[PDB]
Amino acid sequence: VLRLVMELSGEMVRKCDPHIGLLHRGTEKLIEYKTYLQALPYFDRLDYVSMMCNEQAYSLAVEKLLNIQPPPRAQWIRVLFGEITRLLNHIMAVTTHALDIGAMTPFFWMFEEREKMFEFYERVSGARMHAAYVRPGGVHQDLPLGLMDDIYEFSKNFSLRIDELEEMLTNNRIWRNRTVDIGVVTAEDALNYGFSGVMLRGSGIQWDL
Amino acid sequence: NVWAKEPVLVASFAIAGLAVILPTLSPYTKYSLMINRATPYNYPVPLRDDGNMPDVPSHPQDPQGPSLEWLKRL
Amino acid sequence: MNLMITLLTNFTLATLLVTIAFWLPQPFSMKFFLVAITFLLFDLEIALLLPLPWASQTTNLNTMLTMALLLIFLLAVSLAYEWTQKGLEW
Amino acid sequence: TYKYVNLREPSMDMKSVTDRAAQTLLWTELIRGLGMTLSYLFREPATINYPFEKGPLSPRFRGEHALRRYPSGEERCIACKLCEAVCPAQAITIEAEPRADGSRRTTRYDIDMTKCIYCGFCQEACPVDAIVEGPNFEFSTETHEELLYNKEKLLNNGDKWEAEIAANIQADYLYR
Amino acid sequence: ELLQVLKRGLQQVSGHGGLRGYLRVLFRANDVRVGTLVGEDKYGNKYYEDNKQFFGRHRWVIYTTEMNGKNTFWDVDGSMVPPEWHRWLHCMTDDP
Amino acid sequence: MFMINVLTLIIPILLAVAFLTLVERKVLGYMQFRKGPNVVGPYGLLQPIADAIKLFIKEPLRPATSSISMFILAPILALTLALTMWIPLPMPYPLINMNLGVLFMLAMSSLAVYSILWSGWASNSKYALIGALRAVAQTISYEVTLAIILLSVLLMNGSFTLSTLIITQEQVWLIFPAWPLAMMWFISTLAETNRAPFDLTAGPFALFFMAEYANIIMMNIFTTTLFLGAFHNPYMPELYTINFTIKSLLLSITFLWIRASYPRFRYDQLMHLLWKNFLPLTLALCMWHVSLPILLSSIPPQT
Amino acid sequence: MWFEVLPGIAVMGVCLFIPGMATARIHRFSNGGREKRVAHYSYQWYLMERDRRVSGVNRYYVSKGLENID
Amino acid sequence: SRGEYVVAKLDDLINWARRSSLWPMTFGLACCAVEMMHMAAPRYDMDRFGVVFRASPRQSDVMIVAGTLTNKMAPALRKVYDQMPEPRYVVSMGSCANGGGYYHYSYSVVRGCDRIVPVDIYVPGCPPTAEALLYGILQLQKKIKREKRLRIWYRR
Amino acid sequence: MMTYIVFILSIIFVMGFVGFSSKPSPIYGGLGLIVSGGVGCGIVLNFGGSFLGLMVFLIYLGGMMVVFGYTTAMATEQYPSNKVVLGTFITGLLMEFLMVYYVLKDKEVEIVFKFNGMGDWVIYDTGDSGFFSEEAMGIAALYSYGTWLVIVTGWSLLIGVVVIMEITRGN
Numbered sequence A: 001v002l003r004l005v006m007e008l009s010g011e012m013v014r015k016c017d018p019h020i021g022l023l024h025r026g027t028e029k030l031i032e033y034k035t036y037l038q039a040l041p042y043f044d045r046l047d048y049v050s051m052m053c054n055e056q057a058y059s060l061a062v063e064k065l066l067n068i069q070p071p072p073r074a075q076w077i078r079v080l081f082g083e084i085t086r087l088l089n090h091i092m093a094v095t096t097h098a099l100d101i102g103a104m105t106p107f108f109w110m111f112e113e114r115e116k117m118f119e120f121y122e123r124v125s126g127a128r129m130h131a132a133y134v135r136p137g138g139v140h141q142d143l144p145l146g147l148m149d150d151i152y153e154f155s156k157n158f159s160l161r162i163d164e165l166e167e168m169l170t171n172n173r174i175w176r177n178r179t180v181d182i183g184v185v186t187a188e189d190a191l192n193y194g195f196s197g198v199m200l201r202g203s204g205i206q207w208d209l
Numbered sequence B: 001n002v003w004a005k006e007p008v009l010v011a012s013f014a015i016a017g018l019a020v021i022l023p024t025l026s027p028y029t030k031y032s033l034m035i036n037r038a039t040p041y042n043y044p045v046p047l048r049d050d051g052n053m054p055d056v057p058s059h060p061q062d063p064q065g066p067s068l069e070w071l072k073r074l
Numbered sequence C: 001m002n003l004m005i006t007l008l009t010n011f012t013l014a015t016l017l018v019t020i021a022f023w024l025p026q027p028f029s030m031k032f033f034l035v036a037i038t039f040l041l042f043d044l045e046i047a048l049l050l051p052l053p054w055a056s057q058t059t060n061l062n063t064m065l066t067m068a069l070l071l072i073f074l075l076a077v078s079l080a081y082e083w084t085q086k087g088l089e090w
Numbered sequence D: 001t002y003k004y005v006n007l008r009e010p011s012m013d014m015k016s017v018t019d020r021a022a023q024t025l026l027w028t029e030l031i032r033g034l035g036m037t038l039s040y041l042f043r044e045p046a047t048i049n050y051p052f053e054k055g056p057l058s059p060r061f062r063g064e065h066a067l068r069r070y071p072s073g074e075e076r077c078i079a080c081k082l083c084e085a086v087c088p089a090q091a092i093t094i095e096a097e098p099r100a101d102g103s104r105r106t107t108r109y110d111i112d113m114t115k116c117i118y119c120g121f122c123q124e125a126c127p128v129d130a131i132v133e134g135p136n137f138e139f140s141t142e143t144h145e146e147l148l149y150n151k152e153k154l155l156n157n158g159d160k161w162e163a164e165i166a167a168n169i170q171a172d173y174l175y176r
Numbered sequence E: 001e002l003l004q005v006l007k008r009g010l011q012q013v014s015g016h017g018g019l020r021g022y023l024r025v026l027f028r029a030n031d032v033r034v035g036t037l038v039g040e041d042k043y044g045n046k047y048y049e050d051n052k053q054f055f056g057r058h059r060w061v062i063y064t065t066e067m068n069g070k071n072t073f074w075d076v077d078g079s080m081v082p083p084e085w086h087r088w089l090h091c092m093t094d095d096p
Numbered sequence F: 001m002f003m004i005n006v007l008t009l010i011i012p013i014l015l016a017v018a019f020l021t022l023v024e025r026k027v028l029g030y031m032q033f034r035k036g037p038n039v040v041g042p043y044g045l046l047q048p049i050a051d052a053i054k055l056f057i058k059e060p061l062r063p064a065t066s067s068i069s070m071f072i073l074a075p076i077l078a079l080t081l082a083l084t085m086w087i088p089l090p091m092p093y094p095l096i097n098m099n100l101g102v103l104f105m106l107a108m109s110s111l112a113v114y115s116i117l118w119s120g121w122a123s124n125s126k127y128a129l130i131g132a133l134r135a136v137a138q139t140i141s142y143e144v145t146l147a148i149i150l151l152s153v154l155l156m157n158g159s160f161t162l163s164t165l166i167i168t169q170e171q172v173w174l175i176f177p178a179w180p181l182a183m184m185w186f187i188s189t190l191a192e193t194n195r196a197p198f199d200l201t202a203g204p205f206a207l208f209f210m211a212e213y214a215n216i217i218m219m220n221i222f223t224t225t226l227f228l229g230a231f232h233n234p235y236m237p238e239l240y241t242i243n244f245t246i247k248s249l250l251l252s253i254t255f256l257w258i259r260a261s262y263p264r265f266r267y268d269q270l271m272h273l274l275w276k277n278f279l280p281l282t283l284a285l286c287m288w289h290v291s292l293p294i295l296l297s298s299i300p301p302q303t
Numbered sequence G: 001m002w003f004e005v006l007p008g009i010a011v012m013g014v015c016l017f018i019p020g021m022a023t024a025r026i027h028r029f030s031n032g033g034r035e036k037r038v039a040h041y042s043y044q045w046y047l048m049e050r051d052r053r054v055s056g057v058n059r060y061y062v063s064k065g066l067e068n069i070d
Numbered sequence H: 001s002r003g004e005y006v007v008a009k010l011d012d013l014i015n016w017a018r019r020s021s022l023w024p025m026t027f028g029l030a031c032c033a034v035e036m037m038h039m040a041a042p043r044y045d046m047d048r049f050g051v052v053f054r055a056s057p058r059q060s061d062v063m064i065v066a067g068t069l070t071n072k073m074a075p076a077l078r079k080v081y082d083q084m085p086e087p088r089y090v091v092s093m094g095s096c097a098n099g100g101g102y103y104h105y106s107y108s109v110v111r112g113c114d115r116i117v118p119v120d121i122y123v124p125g126c127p128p129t130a131e132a133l134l135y136g137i138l139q140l141q142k143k144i145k146r147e148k149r150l151r152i153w154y155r156r
Numbered sequence I: 001m002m003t004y005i006v007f008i009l010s011i012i013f014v015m016g017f018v019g020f021s022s023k024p025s026p027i028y029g030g031l032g033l034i035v036s037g038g039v040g041c042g043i044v045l046n047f048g049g050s051f052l053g054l055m056v057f058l059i060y061l062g063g064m065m066v067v068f069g070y071t072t073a074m075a076t077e078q079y080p081s082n083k084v085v086l087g088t089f090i091t092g093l094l095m096e097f098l099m100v101y102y103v104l105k106d107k108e109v110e111i112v113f114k115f116n117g118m119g120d121w122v123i124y125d126t127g128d129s130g131f132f133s134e135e136a137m138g139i140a141a142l143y144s145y146g147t148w149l150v151i152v153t154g155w156s157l158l159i160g161v162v163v164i165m166e167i168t169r170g171n
């Protein structure tokens, strides 16, 4: 929940100030008054929809400072869960965009998919969402036997379900006519204003970390 | 040329142009006028017998007057 | 007065519903105004148009066809005029 | 390597532009969307009947905070304070006293279930595996006093069952 | 293929034991898929394991009345199951 | 016997609306992967009975309004329109055989526009006034179009009597001599009943809710009557009652099913859409339905 | 599945079935097996008024069939 | 006592009517909002229990305080709580809300939410896995089943 | 529920015209004009009564007081009875009941007329075969013979459209 103060000529604008800081929690000072391994879940849950790439970034920060390369099986498992987290966060971005725009049901279809992904997180770490699970210095407590077949079956079924989402929306005329005309991003402004990620992938210049 | 930009406009102008022009060419508007004329709302009032009229038959079975026979043949 | 009886029954039963629902628990913009008078003038021309199915039964049909097309064509001229002169845009 | 979207042009063949204009005038892919949604209407719904069919879980769920004890024996804990040191919420509070037997023991062992973020660090930090993240997650507490557990609430929570927790630990003592 | 599902839909009703007994489990909450009867249980209650349904409708409990003396015909609770059936019921295993 | 007819017509509308709430919640539930409401009793019927009686129990927010008498006067008007407005619609033999009833339908819809405006004025401060003012504008935007399409679809039927309509739709349904006119009419009925894809984003919410869903059932009954209907045999009219109720049910399900799967429109996109897409095309269909029966030599036998 | 939405649809359809059957039954019941005569135009009204006048009982549905020719 | 019999049966009826639907408002600041959405998911229904997610605080039956409550937020939270109809009930969901939680020893975090509103049902977990929240809502419904409101109105 | 019902509806019509001739807030004025138009519709439907009162019901009570309340919403506020409005309402009701009493218990009260004081069932047709409810085919004749009239009517309304857009800042 954000506060927004917009000063507007009517059904239009003049200015718009997003007042934010409402969800402030003292995270940096609290990490300053703890150790590394104790204060890992702060970086697990400061960003909360993505849940393992944040851990991967903090683990790579501590590993890059500490000069320790993880073993390669931990690296490939970390790649797998980074792609699971990427899939989950992009599909939640799509569905909360759709639910805030209207468009009731594909939200629920893809949250059935995300319920299966939380089942995968349960079988791997044990908790529902906030798998700590990525220690700096390699991944802790590897996955139990009888998981890769489940991931493979999910991969096939989710390929079919994302094709059926593209069937549902995406060349729908009035959702297109809702969002085509609005929100251009100049590449000069895309580099000055410090946009990142999907903004850089969409607004022209080719850039992937 | 214009069929890609504003197609509902062009469809509306086409059906409007045929709704204006199309009532000219007709073998049917004469039938429209005959059927619409031949419906008696009011009473058919009779007339005084003899101004020496060798027409206008007295029994309504007599076909001397103009009957209607294009009705039952559609 | 029999549909007045139906009207009275509907009104009294609705007031019973409202009184049980209440006594048992105890600047502007210019662009809004264009739509108003636009509705008003086009609804007046609809008021002209709507007795047309009363009129189809007469012995003078060509003039009625011509002037009915003239009325709807004038309504189209008014709509196309405000369309071309940026009347309802944003 | 890249694969970018939306680089074409609308065609100039009359058939393609009249197919697009037919989509415009005739509400076609809207009806195809209705067909897709009815195709998901005629599936069977994947709802679980909750109080009779409970949800699937893992062997290593992190729940109840129940202590354990020895086979036909006494309390498993030591008051060695490793769980209190590793506890990131600092919800563990331990006061120790030794008893007449000579072996070291406790007096007070409080978990702030309000503060507990349910990590697993106290599960993985106990050298004798005394404190265990329990199996079930059904707390649902009216007052605010009852979410502050004593040692006796934890031991009654670990003596209402251990065979569950023993089955889980005997299932997965090899990973951790 | 029309009367057969209507014929099979009677088979869990007349197979249940009667009409008011079917009405009791219908008015309890929902379940009409009776017929496997895997595990009876001390403090009364029963456990039904089926394989013909999807993952999530394998195993369901049906509670009995007065298991504490509290008239639990209505208002059934969680944690009314003993813990070995709590290992079995949450699909942490395949052995009853 | 006349007040008995009145009671048998206006008592079951409450049962109709509450069971419509369970019907649309279960239909949206099976459009999703949901069951429910099915835990509360057999398949959730006393659950709409229960939440209706709960919302009558639940204590109102104290006003905090202005002109309390006007706050009384608006929802009483909405619900008395929803009560009075099933009269000439023929379930086989209608309640009052009128010379003209469809202009009465459109005028009562305009009175519903009045009720929405009065609730929006008497409710609260400025932002509720602006939102309800835009809602009144997007409700009033369509009594041009729907009345125009009504005029075009019964120009092929001569009289306003609606029993000549239930006669002259015996051979083929009137969906076939006007499919685009009827489709634009159904879009305008979605606009009159004001559901998704047409946006919205107080008290009594029960009565607001009641007037809206009775308006929905009314517009779908008038949809079924206006466009189709099978043959009426006297001295057995239960056949026509059954077939009428079945097709009105199917079209109400299709109505909610069109609500179920589309995003809401932007407001200026909605006005742009209505004017610059429907209104020249409705005029063109009017003038072609004027020029057609003089070319088929078939003006309707206007009694 | 949708086998259990059909009880709700069926009950709401029965709640929509009652005014049609009740209205047609009361129209066939209020004139002794006849139908309620309609009067859109004054010709039918004068015909109905002389019909209710000649029957003697001051009710139009009886309608004095052929037993008073001479 | 036929009057006491009538008052007991009518109190049972109206308390059943109260516990029937209980449509909430989803307040939902942080990741507990995502978990409320995931008990709004197609697997765990809410409509089976009469519960409907809804952004209307003018008619909401219960209020689910979920997420980390801060000082910049708490006047707005209680101002939402004050324009709520007077039969009102509160579910505190999540470690952050039911006693401060992980950001406890910190400025600009209200230590719990008893410092703002009264709390009826605490449901802990971080996030409380949706089965636990649903059992908490069942215990809230049984709290509504035990009210004896009209009996106290009789013998008052 | 008696014979003088057109007279009674006329009295409620004058009640409404006094009720918003007392100069209230304009939303109360619009409410009073809707009440007056509804009972005037009742009067003209009681004189038989086919089309014209159901026609005014769509226009004034369908699309004119809507625009009046719309303009009351967008332009004025009237943010918060008075002795002037209540005094004018009492004097109007006084004039009403004074005229009604002095007509009902006499022959006539005249501004300059001769008002025969009794119920207006007189005058009416003697049950003739009208067969089309005369006003219906009357306004149906508005298109066959109405050559000049609808031409200047439509031209006046088209000019009204261009007038409104010019005054509200053409183009």
Ligand code: SF4
Binding pocket: D076, D077, D078, D079, D080, D081, D082, D083, D084, D094, D125, D126, D127, D128, D129, D130, D131
């Ligand atoms: S780590 Fe284990 S033995 Fe040590 S104090 Fe904690 S529970 Fe006791």
Ligand code: SF4
Binding pocket: D083, D086, D087, D088, D089, D090, D091, D092, D111, D115, D116, D117, D118, D119, D120, D121, D122, D123
């Ligand atoms: S799970 Fe974490 S917060 Fe909870 S007691 Fe253990 S270490 Fe502390």
Ligand code: SF4
Binding pocket: A045, H030, H031, H032, H066, H067, H068, H093, H094, H095, H096, H097, H101, H102, H125, H126, H127, H128
């Ligand atoms: S209690 Fe846990 S899951 Fe909930 S808001 Fe706090 S960090 Fe997120």
